[PDB]
């Protein structure tokens, strides 16, 4: 099956594995997040509804008044996205909230309602997500990347024996909440349990534990096992079981029933343990010395004296034994306290506890929280209550509670958002168990411990913070109670919420500036997973652990796409099929494998649940029914990789592209490249510049269509139809009969964007790609944007490349480029620069814009009009004047084009403050857009009138009126005709009513547009008017420009060589680019060679088609060849049949293939060498791929054959003309009198301390004296140096640098006296 939009150029698709899951909408990470933020949720779980319900209702301090939340609605945005970009205003919607203030009677019982007031409050302005998942803030277009932090919960960690010199491991537990203070339990080198809150001072654990109203007896019973002693005749015995004797030593001969059971002295034996188990004897005789190491459990006192005999956690001796025996206490309770099994960490902590009253414990907690303050009981109680057990100051949220219950092996995943008694008890018990061998520690890098915080969650958090601030304000206002004097509008101020939301969206570490220099960069930036930002790591504190790649990144996070330099592995990019779980964790598709048969039921598996199952490999051969052809297959179980059986498999990958991201999936032959070179290739492909004319990639991957469509650069038809009118700036689609709604059928109109400045000063331009009267369907591209060819990504060109050394002009990485490339303007790009001149109101008279400029000739003002604003289309150059600005004194302050760049003014946008006289250029511009609006409205009215009159004619003709008479009648008289049919008469009357309402509607719309456009503007205070100028520079390639490939083989053009010097093959066709072969072996990027060999084969097919069309051969011979090429391959997935194509369709397809038949190659399922050889043999090219060239300059054959083929070249955004810089004498700084820095300020190169050391390593002292004194900052020594040079002399004066005197004053500005001395 094939639709008409792709029948133009079918891409020959290699690849054997059938695809099951189509690539999802690439922006669904963004769109599906913010959608939850501003959608109505009756359950009150997501976004604004839950944010309001989390704070409201409001109760007064006296309890006599309250505020109720009802609902909310979002208004219509004042300006559209295009208007917002033009006018420099935020695209946002107003938030209207319905509040209800009800006051309770003071003398009446609770629940007595006095008054009910319902009103709407303008609570603030919420920025909106554009259709492309991007935000418009201030005329710009920002993207909020998704953070990757640690999920709230409990995490068990170990220090790996690195802190202490003895190498012992120090386990610990952390309790991370979603909001509130932290909590840590940790051990010490002496095996003492400790607790620390908010990383503050270390405290003994039980201090906090006894803060929960615990008695020491209860603590010991809860944290230990009781051992019972009964005082029998002459001895005291215990009941004994084998399980309490494992891994112990017999202090005495363990024997009972008069028979020896265990030996004396040596360690215990398992056989005697089994003998005790089978005998089932409990009570055993006990000596005296065996009790000397035990610790009493509960308090025991005398009932006669009433004094304390033995206390909890106290060592006991024979004296206490006799004291308890004489008191009649037959029952004695001790602790298990076995070194191997039940470590005695609680007992020793109870030993080191300073007190046991819990009041001194609370006082100590209060002291640790904040030092230097009286320990009032009420303050300490309030602090302890509000530190963990207050919902206002502490919250675990749903994900935190889920992780908390899962990590402790509980059963439910729902509970309170705060801690409790049982939570802390379980955490301590689990940490003790971990210290006691049982259990394992967690891994921080695991993707089961880190979740995705999208834009919706961030906005919800910021909105909640603002709402809490407003809550505090309204509470302090309601504290002053009153009798219905206030109206619930002055109590709520939108300023705090608006400021918080605005600052989050505008100035933040994650609301980054979108880089739109091609669709791929936009897609990659939108689908990014940043680990930095608030509540995250930093570029300096991150070590080698988070930066490294984990086995669970398989399918969720791309391994080979991460920026190099200071943050590598922190800004990794999301994978292709990976989506976000319900709680925020990542998850990937997997095809369930049943009874050895692979099905097509996709299950989304998260990180942790990947461990339990056994997952097969993506590229495993199968039959037609899913049976594995091999009884042994490759699988991964727990981050491992080993051979399993065909019955032990449980899941299978959907496709081979599942592991890589988008940018890495656009690279052909990725599996033949080293990982570093693939990384560099993806990063540089993200930097490509849109050329003048886009050209398809001969060797691709098939993701080009997805990347082009998903990014908002191609105009995609909403409904199918036929192109009624096609133009360079608009497309009109008459919707097909099946797709009209019951009312208001109408048509569709798409308005393209022509030569609009991008964020990187590039050019965004859209061109129609459909012909007049051509059918279209939904989802089909109607106008390709920048770097797109017929709805297909195309970032660079394809050049005939040769791998050979050529006289040293391609020495290390340089490239040699023929002049035929420059002549054809293949790599010519367009850049658009914006200049802004702002009229302010300064002192000594305001600044004016006029053509009266002194000390300038007529040439400098010829390009200017009497208005002073340069004409649109003037070929301005460096140094000229765009806007004539002068400041009264009069001094010339006119805006000028910075030197080094040509220009051609294409647009001038003028913003004039309200109530300010408008200049002539402003009047001309305003007449321009009012005429444009008039034309647009007239066209819409004419289209709607045509539709209405078609309906009118259809109704009247069906009513008995002849068609000829109706046509000969005026259109207005059609509604006035009397119809014998009442139903037809009613229809005509309704049509006339619609006629009148329609004309009223267009009149109102025209009046509204007139009022809107002609009205003034809002902008920064202290500005008279704002004028903007756009300049269009047409860059070409020159020696110094940076070019690259898709496989990381960057380079710099070193020479533009004449066409007569390029090597030429037997047919006389010169090559366009000469590359160095020696860059392939060391770099190990063999992908470029295979791409070259495949492109040579692909162009061979295209040339033959170009030969058939030139000879004007019939369709029958042509159709035969195209079918032969498309049928090539071994077990090719794609099946293209030309039988369904008409003759015109075949001719058009062949017309679109004369530049070379495109080739598709999946990432890890690409074409092998045999397919390339077969494709080459189909053409007229050698199978080896190496042809015999000739030297252009000498005409002599090269001694060896060389590799020639077509390779895809990109022009990176590092142009030499934007980097060349020089300076003799410019402007100097203010304090240090040193030359400025940067190209913009005409600054000089910094001569750093390393260069000073380099000059010191020589014998160079006079050069150093120059660089330090007479070139940098010796004010009295550089004015004379300039005079000497012009005088013909070359001599310096040492002087005294002015950057050292300042230092003296600085040190002299303190109490220190530093001074020089005598001569």
């Amino acid at each position: 099956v094939y639709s008409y939009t792709e029948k133009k150029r079918i891409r020959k698709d290699f690849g054997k594995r059938p695809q099951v899951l189509d690539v999802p909408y690439l922006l669904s990470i963004q769109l599906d997040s913010f959608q939850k933020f501003i959608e109505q949720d009756p359950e009150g779980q997501y976004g604004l509804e839950a944010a309001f319900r989390s704070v409201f209702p409001i109760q007064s301090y006296s309890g006599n008044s309250e505020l109720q939340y009802v609902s909310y609605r979002l208004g219509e945005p004042v300006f559209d996205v295009q208007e917002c970009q033009i006018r420099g205003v935020t695209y946002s919607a107003p938030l209207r909230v319905k509040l209800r203030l009800v006051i309770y009677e003071r003398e009446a019982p609770e629940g007595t309602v006095k008054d009910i007031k319902e009103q709407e409050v303008y609570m603030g302005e919420i920025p909106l997500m554009t259709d492309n998942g991007t935000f418009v803030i201030n005329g710009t277009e920002r993207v909020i990347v998704s953070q990757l932090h640690r999920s709230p919960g409990v995490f068990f960690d170990s220090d790996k024996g690195k802190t202490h010199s003895s190498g012992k491991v120090l386990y610990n537990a952390r309790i991370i909440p979603y909001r509130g203070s932290w909590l840590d339990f940790e051990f010490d080198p002496k095996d003492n349990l400790f607790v620390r809150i908010d990383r503050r001072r270390k405290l003994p654990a039980t201090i906090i534990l006894r803060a929960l109203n615990y008695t020491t007896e209860q603590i010991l019973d809860l944290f230990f096992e009781k051992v019972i002693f009964e005082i029998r005749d002459n001895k005291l015995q215990m009941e004994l079981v084998p399980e309490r004797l494992r891994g112990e030593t017999a202090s005495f001969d363990i024997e009972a029933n008069g028979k020896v059971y265990v030996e004396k002295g040596r360690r215990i034996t398992a056989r005697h343990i089994r003998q005790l188990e089978k005998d089932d004897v409990k009570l055993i005789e006990v000596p005296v010395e065996y009790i000397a190491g035990k610790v009493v459990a509960k308090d025991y006192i005398d009932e006669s004296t009433g004094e304390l005999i033995c206390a909890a956690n106290m060592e006991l001796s024979l004296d206490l034994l006799a004291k308890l025996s004489q008191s009649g206490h037959k029952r004695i309770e001790t602790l298990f306290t076995n070194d191997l099994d039940h470590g005695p960490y609680i007992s020793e902590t109870l030993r080191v506890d300073p007190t046991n009253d819990r009041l001194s414990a609370l006082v100590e907690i209060y002291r640790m929280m904040r030092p230097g303050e009286p320990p009032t009981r009420e303050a300490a109680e309030s602090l302890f209550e509000n530190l963990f057990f207050s919902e206002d100051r502490y919250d675990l949220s749903a994900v935190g509670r889920m992780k908390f219950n899962r990590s402790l092996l509980r059963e439910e995943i729902e509970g309170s958002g705060i801690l409790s008694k049982d939570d802390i008890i379980d955490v301590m018990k689990k940490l003790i168990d971990i210290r006691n061998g049982k259990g394992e520690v967690d891994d921080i890098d695991h993707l089961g411990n880190r979740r995705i915080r999208s834009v919706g969650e961030m906005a919800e958090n910021q909105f909640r913070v603002g709402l809490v601030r407003v809550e505090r304000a309204v509470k302090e206002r309601l504290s002053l109670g009153d009798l219905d004097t206030l109206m619930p509008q002055d109590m709520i101020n939108a300023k705090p919420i608006s400021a918080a939301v605005k600052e989050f969206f505008g100035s933040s570490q994650l609301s980054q500036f979108m880089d739109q220099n091609n669709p791929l960069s936009e897609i990659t930036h939108k689908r990014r997973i940043s680990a930095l930002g608030p509540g995250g790591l930093t570029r300096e504190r991150a070590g080698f652990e988070v930066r490294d790649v984990h086995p669970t990144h398989y399918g969720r996070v791309c391994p080979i796409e991460t920026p190099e330099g200071p943050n590598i592995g922190l800004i990794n990019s999301l994978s292709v099929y990976a989506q976000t779980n319900e709680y925020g964790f990542l998850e990937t598709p997997y095809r369930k494998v049943t009874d050895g048969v692979v099905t097509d039921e996709i299950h989304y598996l998260s990180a942790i649940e990947e461990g339990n199952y056994v997952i097969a490999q993506a590229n495993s051969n199968l039959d037609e029914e899913g049976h594995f052809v091999e009884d042994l297959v490759t699988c991964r179980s727990k981050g491992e990789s080993s051979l399993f059986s065909r019955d032990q498999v449980d899941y299978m990958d959907v496709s081979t592209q599942q592991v890589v991201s988008v940018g890495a999936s656009l690279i052909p032959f990725l599996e033949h490249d080293d990982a570093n070179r693939a990384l560099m290739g993806a990063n540089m492909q993200r930097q490509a510049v849109p050329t003048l004319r886009a050209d398809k990639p001969l060797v691709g991957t098939g993701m080009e269509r997805a990347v082009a469509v998903d990014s908002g650069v191609t105009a995609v038809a909403k409904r199918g139809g036929v192109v009624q009118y096609v133009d360079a700036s608009r497309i009109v689609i008459k919707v097909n009969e099946d797709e009209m709604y019951p009312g208001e059928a109408g048509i569709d109109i798409y308005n393209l964007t022509k030569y609009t400045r991008s964020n990187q000063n590039t050019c965004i331009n859209q061109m129609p790609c459909v012909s007049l009267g051509e059918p279209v369907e939904r989802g089909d591209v109607l106008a390709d944007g920048p770097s797109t060819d017929l709805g297909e990504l195309a970032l660079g060109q394809n050049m005939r490349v040769a791998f050979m050394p050529w006289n040293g002009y391609n020495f290390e990485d340089s490239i040699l480029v023929s002049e035929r490339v420059v002549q054809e303007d293949r790599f010519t790009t367009i850049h658009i620069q914006e200049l802004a001149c702002v009229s302010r109101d300064t002192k000594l008279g305001p600044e004016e814009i006029t053509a009266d400029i002194p000390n300038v000739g007529e040439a400098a003002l010829s390009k200017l009009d009497e208005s002073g604003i340069v004409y649109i289309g003037a070929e301005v150059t460096g140094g000229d004047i765009l806007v004539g600005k002068v400041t009264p004194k009069v001094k010339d302050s006119s805006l000028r084009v910075p030197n080094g760049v040509s220009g051609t003014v294409i647009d001038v946008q003028v913003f004039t403050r309200d109530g300010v006289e408008k200049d002539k250029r402003a009047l001309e511009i305003e007449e321009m857009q009012l005429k444009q609006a008039k034309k647009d409205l007239s066209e819409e009215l004419q289209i709607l009138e045509a539709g209405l009159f078609s309906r009118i004619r259809a109704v009247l003709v069906a009513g008995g009126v002849e068609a000829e008479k109706l046509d000969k009648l005026p259109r207005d008289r059609w509604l006035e005709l009397g119809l014998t049919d009442e139903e037809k008469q009613n229809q005509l009357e309704q049509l006339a009513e619609q006629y009148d309402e329609l004309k009223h509607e267009f009149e109102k719309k025209l009046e509204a547009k007139r009022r809107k456009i002609t009205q003034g503007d809002d902008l920064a205070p202290g500005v008279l008017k704002i004028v903007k100028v756009y300049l269009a520079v047409k860059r070409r390639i020159q020696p110094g420009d940076k070019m690259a490939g898709r496989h990381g083989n960057k380079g710099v053009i070193s020479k533009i060589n004449p066409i007569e010097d390029m090597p030429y093959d037997e047919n006389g066709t010169p090559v366009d680019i000469v590359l160095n072969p020696l860059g392939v072996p060391s770099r190990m990027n063999i992908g470029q060679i295979l791409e070259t060999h495949l492109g040579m084969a692909a162009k061979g097919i295209g040339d033959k088609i170009n030969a058939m069309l030139k000879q004007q051969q019939e369709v029958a011979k042509l159709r035969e060849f195209i079918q032969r090429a498309y049928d090539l391959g071994a077990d090719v997935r794609q099946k293209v049949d030309l039988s369904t194509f008409s003759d015109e369709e075949v001719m058009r397809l062949a017309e679109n293939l004369r530049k070379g038949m495109p080739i598709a190659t999946p990432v890890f399922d690409g074409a092998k060498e045999a397919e390339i050889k077969e494709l080459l043999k189909l053409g007229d090219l050698p199978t080896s791929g190496q042809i015999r060239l000739y030297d252009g300059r000498t005409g002599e054959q090269f001694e060896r054959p060389v590799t020639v083929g077509y390779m895809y070249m990109l022009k990176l955004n590092h142009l030499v003309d934007d980097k060349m810089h020089a300076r003799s004498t410019g402007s100097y700084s203010l304090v240090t009198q040193q030359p400025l820095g940067g190209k913009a300020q005409f600054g000089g190169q910094r001569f750093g301390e390393m260069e000073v050391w380099a000059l010191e390593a020589y014998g160079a002292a006079y050069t150093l004296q120059e660089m330090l004194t007479v070139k940098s900052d010796d004010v009295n020594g550089r004015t004379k140096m300039y005079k000497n040079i012009v005088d013909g002399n070359h001599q310096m004066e040492p002087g005294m640098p002015e950057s050292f005197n300042v230092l003296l004053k600085e040190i002299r500005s303190l109490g220190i006296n530093i001074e020089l001395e005598d001569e």
Partner: protein, 652 residues
């Protein structure tokens, strides 16, 4: 400083000063009114805190912040730190007469020249042009000269050409790790906007032509120009200061050309013919009557300096090839013919240059280096050496070997299940088996790649060293090594986890054939680790350099001979295996603290206070000296410096 608008740009210091003066005024007014001591003490404490913040903010505790909620800059913080005055405006400062640009490659330049764009040159040398322009009367006032220069007349170009005759410029690349990162050159006026750089210096600069940028400075006074010419110019810097090894070693493109030129073939066009001399060998190769490398007999006149520094002619018939005979036409007089008779890989060619520096001085050495570069580029272009997908020969036994290796682990997995083998020893056995299999595959691949079959003149099959392109780049030393060629044809081998554990299953697929999703995923563990280490090692290393420069910045040679017999005993280092360093290198270029005693009693082999050079070192080797005592800087008794003799010899 006033900015655009009603707001004014004020520094962090003004706010602190205003705070302090306001607090002082409040205390002055409050104390004179006999206010209670409750408020007086608090006001005085607040004044103390304000002065503390002004003098040094943040030392005590929470630093006072402005509207930005960021700590303000105090006087103490304005000096301390990387942004402070000392490390930003005193040690290193911005300079005039400087430019920055992208560097490309120019192979037509000489060793002492660089390409300078016309626009950059005209902007840099603006003051010099004004002097000449008014000197010749072409412009009376300075304003007329400035107007004439910007209009870009025709005579201005001639004047600029005149003023760049012998005016060196300092080319610089950041970072400048060593003293060769700043070098003087004589600029050449070229078009474009890129700084053309001589290839041979690229080794010194550590620069590659993939977007690198370099900065150019201009000396002004006569002393600076003479210092540049006499100390900095690249013709004077051909030896490293760290060791005697040169920095003008040809690499990459040149090495491949010189290796292809001097490499014989058993059968070629025009073999066995006898030539008059090297000049004829060039007429045959150009005419196409003889291949570039055919074994011939030629007559060569070589000059040896065996006399007392005098050259003597010598004629003989040598059995060599056309390529070596052609190359002999550029070597200088002193060198013998045995130098250019081998294959001349990367390590040989450098030695050749070294030999010249040992015999003929500096000017013949630099001329020979330039001729080497030109000839190598020319005969590398003429070779047409290319890499193709068919040049990576996969050994045929490889898969078979892999199968056998698999069988081995197929045994152990069974034996581990019978209890005869535990977990750890099974891991060790599998690792050893896979390592042995990888080694065998690598050896088989190398044996297959390094030889080829060719029929000789008589018609019998004879083996010769292969002409495979990838092997020519690997063997000559131009690019790559054995590991890369192994990873392109043989199996990639075992890979390690991020922690360090070796994966049990190795990557059995080379880059020539495909790598599946699982192998490519486990191959990124090493790559990301290496990239992270490289990214985080630049910050640590450079810091170390600073701590090494500031400790030893003030040590300058100030004496000729301190006259002390103290020294350190220098012997060759032995770790229990082969000697890591011979005694010759540890004593070369030093002076003996005392006379060296022969093992025979009372014989003085080396006089005291004598510099040991290569000629003496060879005499030391033939005598088989055991240990030589020499002077060292740490034993010097000179005050506030080190004498010339204790340091030894200037390596540069």
């Amino acid at each position: 400083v006033p900015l655009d608008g009603g707001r004014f740009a004020t520094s962090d210091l003004n706010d602190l000063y205003r705070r302090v003066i306001n607090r002082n005024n409040r205390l002055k007014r409050l104390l004179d009114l006999a206010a209670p001591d409750i408020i007086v003490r608090n006001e005085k404490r607040m004044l103390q805190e304000a002065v503390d913040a002004l003098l040094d903010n943040g030392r005590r505790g929470r630093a006072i912040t402005g509207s930005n909620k960021r700590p303000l800059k105090s006087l103490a913080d304005m000096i301390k730190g990387k942004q402070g005055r000392f490390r930003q405006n005193l040690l290193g400062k911005r300079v005039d007469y400087s430019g920055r640009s992208v560097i490309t490659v120019g192979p037509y330049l000489r060793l002492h020249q660089c390409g300078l764009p016309k626009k950059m040159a005209l902007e840099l040398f603006k003051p010099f042009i004004y002097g000449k322009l008014e000197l010749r009367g072409l412009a009376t006032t300075i304003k007329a000269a400035k107007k004439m220069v910007e209009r870009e007349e025709a005579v201005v170009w001639d004047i600029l050409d005149e003023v760049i005759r012998e005016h060196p410029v300092l080319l610089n690349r950041a970072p400048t790790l060593h003293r060769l990162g700043i070098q003087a050159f004589e600029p050449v006026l070229i078009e474009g906007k890129a700084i053309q750089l001589h290839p041979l210096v690229c080794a010194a600069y550590n620069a590659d032509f993939d977007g690198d940028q370099m900065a150019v400075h201009v000396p002004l006074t006569l002393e600076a120009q003479l210092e540049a010419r006499a100390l900095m110019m690249s013709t004077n810097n051909i030896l490293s200061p760290a060791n005697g090894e040169p920095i003008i070693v040809p690499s990459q493109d040149v090495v491949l050309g010189l290796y292809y030129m001097t490499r014989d073939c058993v059968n070629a066009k025009g073999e066995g013919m006898v030539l008059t001399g090297p000049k004829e060998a060039e007429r045959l190769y150009r005419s196409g009557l003889a291949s570039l490398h055919a074994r011939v007999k030629v007559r060569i006149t070589e000059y040896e300096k065996d006399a007392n520094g005098e050259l003597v002619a010598k004629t003989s018939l040598k059995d060599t090839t056309v390529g070596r005979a052609i190359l002999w036409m550029i070597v200088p007089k002193g060198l013998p013919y045995s130098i250019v008779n081998q294959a001349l890989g990367k390590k040989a060619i450098s030695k050749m240059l070294n030999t010249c520096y040992r015999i003929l001085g500096l000017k013949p050495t630099v001329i020979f280096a330039d001729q080497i570069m030109y000839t190598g580029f020319a005969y590398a272009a003429r070779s047409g050496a290319s890499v193709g997908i068919d040049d990576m020969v996969i050994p045929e036994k490889k898969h078979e070997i892999i199968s056998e290796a698999e069988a081995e682990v197929a045994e152990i997995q069974e034996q581990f299940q019978s209890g005869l083998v535990t977990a750890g020893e099974r891991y060790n056995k599998v690792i050893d088996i896979w390592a042995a299999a990888n080694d065998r595959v690598s050896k088989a691949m190398m044996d297959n790649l390094q030889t080829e079959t060719v029929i000789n003149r008589d018609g019998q099959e004879e083996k010769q060293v292969s002409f495979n392109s990838i092997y020519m780049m690997a063997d000559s030393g131009a690019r790559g090594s054995a590991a890369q060629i192994r990873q392109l044809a043989g199996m990639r081998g075992l890979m390690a986890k991020p922690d360090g554990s070796i994966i049990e299953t190795p990557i059995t697929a080379n880059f020539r054939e495909g790598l599946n999703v699982l192998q490519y995923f486990i191959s990124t563990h090493g790559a990301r680790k290496g990239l992270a280490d490289t990214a985080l090692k630049t910050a640590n290393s450079g810091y170390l350099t600073r701590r090494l420069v500031d400790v030893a910045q003030d040590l300058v040679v100030t004496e000729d001979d301190c006259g002390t017999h103290e020294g350190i005993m220098m012997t060759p280092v032995i770790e229990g295996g082969d000697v890591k360093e011979p005694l010759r290198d540890r004593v070369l270029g030093r002076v003996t603290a005392e006379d060296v005693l022969k093992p025979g009693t009372a014989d003085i082999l080396v006089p005291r206070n004598t510099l040991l050079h290569e000629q003496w070192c060879d005499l030391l080797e033939e005598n088989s000296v055991d240990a030589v005592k020499v002077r060292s800087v740490v034993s010097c008794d000179t005050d506030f410096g080190v004498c010339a003799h204790c340091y030894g010899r200037d390596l540069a």
